[PDB]
Design a protein around this ligand. Structure first.
Ligand SMILES: Cc1nc2ccc(NC(=O)CCNC(=O)NCCOc3ccc(CC(C(=O)O)C(=O)O)cc3)cc2s1
Ligand SMILES: Cc1nc2ccc(NC(=O)CCNC(=O)NCCOc3ccc(CC(C(=O)O)C(=O)O)cc3)cc2s1
Ligand SMILES: Cc1nc2ccc(NC(=O)CCNC(=O)NCCOc3ccc(CC(C(=O)O)C(=O)O)cc3)cc2s1
Ligand SMILES: Cc1nc2ccc(NC(=O)CCNC(=O)NCCOc3ccc(CC(C(=O)O)C(=O)O)cc3)cc2s1
Ligand SMILES: Cc1nc2ccc(NC(=O)CCNC(=O)NCCOc3ccc(CC(C(=O)O)C(=O)O)cc3)cc2s1
Ligand SMILES: Cc1nc2ccc(NC(=O)CCNC(=O)NCCOc3ccc(CC(C(=O)O)C(=O)O)cc3)cc2s1
Ligand SMILES: Cc1nc2ccc(NC(=O)CCNC(=O)NCCOc3ccc(CC(C(=O)O)C(=O)O)cc3)cc2s1
Lengths: 330, 330, 330, 330
């Protein structure tokens, strides 16, 4: 053989991948996550899983053809979950998506049914994984993935409001003529219609915008900053109306979270987690609050100081989500 | 105003972008080129152009929303070519695509018609840009864009065989158990069924595979390495059949060329250029040969020593292209 | 020639660089600025300048030998300023450095004299550049460089407190178990002994540390957070005592500024700029305040709401600098 | 505590890093390896070891201070090897370095004595690590480290000719006006005076320079390409004569090797390995040959087909190293 005439093997020792990531679902969101992760050099192996065999194989092949231009030496795929073995991170992007004028909360029964099959199959092969839930409704589905997997809460994370806050900072950046990296502002609660803009923490270089304009984000606001949060809520629906779905911003948001987990950065992200005990919330509600994210998932929660109004709205977001949780049959 | 209570403006000046890239066409190919260019931090401004307004705006907004995760501070879009003013590089991804089982050569007239409108509009707003042609049949469309633009040949580049070569190195690497970066092999001529594998130059660490296997790539080869090239040829068809189209591999291949251009790397890439005078070729045929690629586009061409068999194959590829090319009127 | 047998030249176009950066001074600081800039791929051309012929050539050569691992195709050096022609960014690291126990302010006469020679020569060859002053005392030398150059104030930037702030954030991060990227805090004023910690602005996810601990930064503070600032002020001296000089942190700080400038990011950095007209300062004092940094240098200043105490501290920093500055002759 | 008012901890756990790198020795080379590894985002933990306590603490602090601009969340140091625990890769840059005009082989006994202390300590704390030997004479010290460690040969690697080859490629690139990435040349054998240029493998885009110029690298060669190899051999001497030592190029070469290891790349590098069984070498000689490098270190070796003269030159290099490997007492 040519290979043996060219190369002498000196070590047969087959090995386990050290930094493996799995993406479940090869729809537009799943593939945006995949390409983003590959372009950030986060994994030594990427596995893709779906139920549509041809689409799955075609997606994997297309990525494989780009290997010369990447630094992820192994890209694999299968409808079989054995292909996901030894993953450090499992990203769940499977399920029904909302039509225009349909709530993400309306996806609940359909996506819980899909999760009942995916979750156990996924956890089985990767004892060291963190579960990163992207599928909607993300908050409810992070709670669902937590209850089905039986994982500790630190290991089960929802992409939640990382994208909402990225949109909030883009929009604030645009109004102020400043890069989003230097515009700070938090959108917490549901990754949906009940999200909460934390006006009290909106700042540039530590300067509170609300200290400058105390009416910031109210109906009394001369510059109607509330319209920025309105634009954040309406973002998915405006883009869906235009191109039929969304994929790039979410793929980059998910890759941002994968980077913190894979590199143990311990950076703070507004992501879906269990908030029972915080803000007088006594139920097992999952929703976005600032979390410290690293190699063991969420190791810590940032206790944001909310004004009674921001706190009322966060509790309103938690009540909405709890009501929806009351519909779950396991 | 809040902005004025927060920020003291010291310079109101609206300066020209210095590293601008335009992508014409927001189909799956154009969007893969856009995402890859953004992940590679190649541009300070990205412009998108298409004819379908909602789609175009939606793609732009989706990319805009991921700004927090990027280093490209301005992403714009319009059907109007004024949006492309002062681009350093304009990437053409517009046009008809082949069906599964249809030659790229069969798109010629449809894409020539579209190029008759696109090219003068690009030239009007960026008369000093480098034109990178991706639309199929790439080799013929590069010639057509060169004829329409009136640009010198160095500034009209076709993505050509950059991808065929990346696929060849991926397959070679998978057979040898070596990363494609360390597997060298060139696929030249038409980015199509008449491409030419240069078996004489196929190597690992400067070790000629042909010196180890004199029948390498021939019908008489025991290991049938010619099948690797057949897999390169069938790549697009295979992927179109499974997923419906191709995008990721071409998007990374285009980002690779954009990088050599934007960064003046002077790396060698197998890309579409005029080959009149080489290998006894008399006509204005454009096809892939190893080119030195930098800030002024194609400055030089590497003279590959071809065997009588490889030469004959390239001459036939040149022959197939001119047969279509000669008939054209625009 | 072998080059002509291998390569056919198609274009004899001289080529002018598009993203050229010059580093004046090949001392530990200049070289740490160079390697960081090179590893962030910010330039297509790097030029080095010094007065020690041998040191200059050796450093230039050592960088050149790493070319295969870099994306900067041209590395050049000379004692002649013609080597720096057409730079977009010129980083000044030439000058005397302070001993242990000596103030950066004591370097003023030696460094003003050196700048009288350097600044006109840089300005002669790069009329479009941004001048980035690193040499000490940075705040006074920025003013000196601005007065000599004839450049508008937006294009004369001091590295200032970008380092002091990175140090503050690292220590804050270490205390909190959070990445410095998520620990916000600002050190303004002189890059020196009179720098000002803006406790009122110190926060994690928008949560004011001073709201949780009102005693923050005072002698009354049980956790002695004032010590974080004392460690920031003592940093250079502590590191000089241990290693003989500082280089890695300043090099990364400078490369951070180079990235916002070269890439037109419009990020907010605490860098040296004219403060006349803010905080009741009546003289042409240059010190660090949060600035929007882009392709035209400093376009805007963020007006920080300082507590009376923090403002008095800032005004004392300004007084300290003017004391030195008013005694200058050039 | 302010930390606890701000943060709620979910999980008080053992933070064993997953991608840990140790650099032993904080001289100019060790620090160039450290900066290059940090700027390539290869590790989640960097540990520095040295015998000079103040110099070590100063270097650690200086890097730590640049943390905000990095993605390596923990940088530590100690003279005690407990700090190196659970390293994936341990880089040895400790020992005497050569003076102007002193041979690397002259450092042999001083460094062997140092390796008798270092190697058992590294092994005690990271028994499963890959050992990357940089200290000179690297070929000999890789054999020394292998014998002392008792590690299998795949996990004991010498930086070897990776730098000699990058230099050769830079010089060839400069001569041809092509980026070093597209210029292929291999320098094998000792990283020093007896290194071997493989003229038969020198090429651009699979085009052999020797087929174009049959006298390439010989005395008869009109263009004197043998002078390119002489410059590779003289490089460290020329740079030591100019700047006092070398650092940038080796640091970048070492980070390149660290990248193949950490990311399981399976790239081919000319590195120090046991060559017993090749080219008529019957003894335990370590020297550079092309090696497939990944997560298990060197798993395979490319059998380079050398000319009778190139083979003779390699046997000569092997004879030189074995003669001295016999000068060893440990
Ligand atoms: C083996 C199996 N086991 C189960 C178990 C349960 C279910 N259950 C359901 O099927 C749930 C009901 N389904 C919906 O109502 N879906 C709403 C439509 O939403 C979408 C979602 C994604 C795209 C992809 C799209 C893009 O990503 O852009 C593209 O790429 O084409 C398009 C439309 C099915 C199976 S199949
Ligand atoms: C038994 C079974 N096993 C499997 C295995 C795989 C699959 N495969 C798929 O179903 C793939 C196709 N479907 C999807 O990709 N759906 C996920 C969409 O998730 C999101 C999440 C967030 C956004 C962001 C957006 C918004 O929040 O709306 C905004 O804010 O912009 C958009 C869409 C099906 C099955 S069935
Ligand atoms: C304002 C205008 N001026 C003109 C002038 C001329 C023409 N020219 C023609 O249309 C002539 C007919 N062309 C073909 O025969 N097309 C073959 C099918 O090729 C494709 C190509 C792309 C996709 C898009 C793809 C993606 O977005 O990735 C997806 O999924 O839809 C789908 C099918 C159109 C216009 S519109
Ligand atoms: C007057 C007018 N102005 C405009 C302006 C914009 C648009 N917009 C579009 O046309 C967008 C939709 N169309 C496309 O995206 N088509 C481009 C397809 O190009 C490629 C190239 C290479 C590959 C790689 C592949 C292969 O080579 O097959 C392999 O090898 O894997 C695949 C597809 C239409 C008009 S009409
Ligand atoms: C053609 C010319 N025209 C002029 C005109 C004026 C002046 N003026 C002065 O010379 C000013 C007087 N100098 C001092 O008092 N120096 C105090 C200590 O400064 C340092 C600085 C750096 C290092 C580290 C550095 C290294 O070791 O060199 C490294 O490699 O990192 C060590 C000590 C010189 C020239 S030369
Ligand atoms: C007529 C002439 N033309 C030339 C041309 C070139 C040269 N060449 C040199 O002078 C090179 C050697 N000199 C230096 O490198 N000195 C500048 C050091 O600048 C800094 C800046 C910041 C820090 C950060 C640090 C701190 O602030 O102390 C902290 O906080 O950690 C440390 C040191 C001399 C001449 S003379
Ligand atoms: C018991 C003990 N434990 C310890 C622990 C730590 C330390 N610490 C140090 O010894 C640090 C200071 N010493 C060094 O840094 N020396 C190593 C230099 O290594 C190289 C390697 C390659 C090149 C490349 C170059 C060339 O090959 O020359 C070219 O080709 O450009 C240059 C220099 C001492 C002891 S003693």
């Amino acid at each position: 053989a040519l290979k043996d005439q060219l190369i002498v093997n000196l070590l047969k020792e087959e090995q386990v991948p050290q930094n493996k990531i799995t993406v479940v679902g090869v729809g537009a969101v799943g593939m945006a996550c995949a390409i983003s992760i590959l372009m950030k050099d986060l994994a030594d192996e990427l596995a893709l899983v779906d139920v549509i065999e041809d689409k799955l194989k075609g997606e994997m092949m297309d990525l494989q053809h780009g290997s010369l231009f990447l630094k992820t030496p192994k890209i694999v795929s299968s409808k079989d979950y054995s292909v996901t073995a030894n993953s450090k991170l499992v990203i769940i992007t499977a399920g029904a998506r909302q039509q225009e004028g349909e709530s993400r909360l309306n996806l609940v029964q359909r996506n819980v049914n899909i999760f009942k099959f995916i979750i156990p199959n996924v956890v089985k092969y990767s004892p060291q994984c963190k579960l990163l839930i992207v599928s909607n409704p993300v908050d409810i589905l992070t709670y669902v993935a937590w209850k089905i997997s039986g994982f500790p809460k630190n290991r089960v994370i929802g992409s939640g409001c990382n994208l909402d806050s990225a949109r909030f900072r883009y929009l604030m950046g645009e109004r102020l003529g400043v890069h989003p990296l230097s515009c700070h502002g938090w959108v917490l609660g549901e990754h949906g219609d009940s999200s909460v803009p934390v006006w009290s923490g909106v700042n540039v270089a530590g300067v509170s915008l609300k200290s400058l304009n105390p009416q910031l984000g109210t109906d009394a606001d001369k510059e109607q900053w509330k319209d920025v949060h309105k634009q954040v809520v309406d973002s998915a629906y405006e883009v869906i109306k235009l191109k039929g779905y969304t994929s790039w911003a979410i793929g980059l948001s998910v890759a941002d979270l994968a980077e913190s987990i894979m590199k143990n950065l311990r950076r703070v992200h507004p992501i879906s987690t269990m908030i029972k005990g915080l803000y007088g919330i006594k139920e097992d509600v999952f929703l976005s609050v600032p979390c410290i994210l690293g190699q063991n998932g969420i190791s810590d929660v940032v206790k944001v100081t909310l004004t009674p109004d921001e706190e009322a709205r966060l509790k309103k977001s938690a009540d909405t989500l709890w009501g929806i949780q009351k519909e779950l049959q396991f």
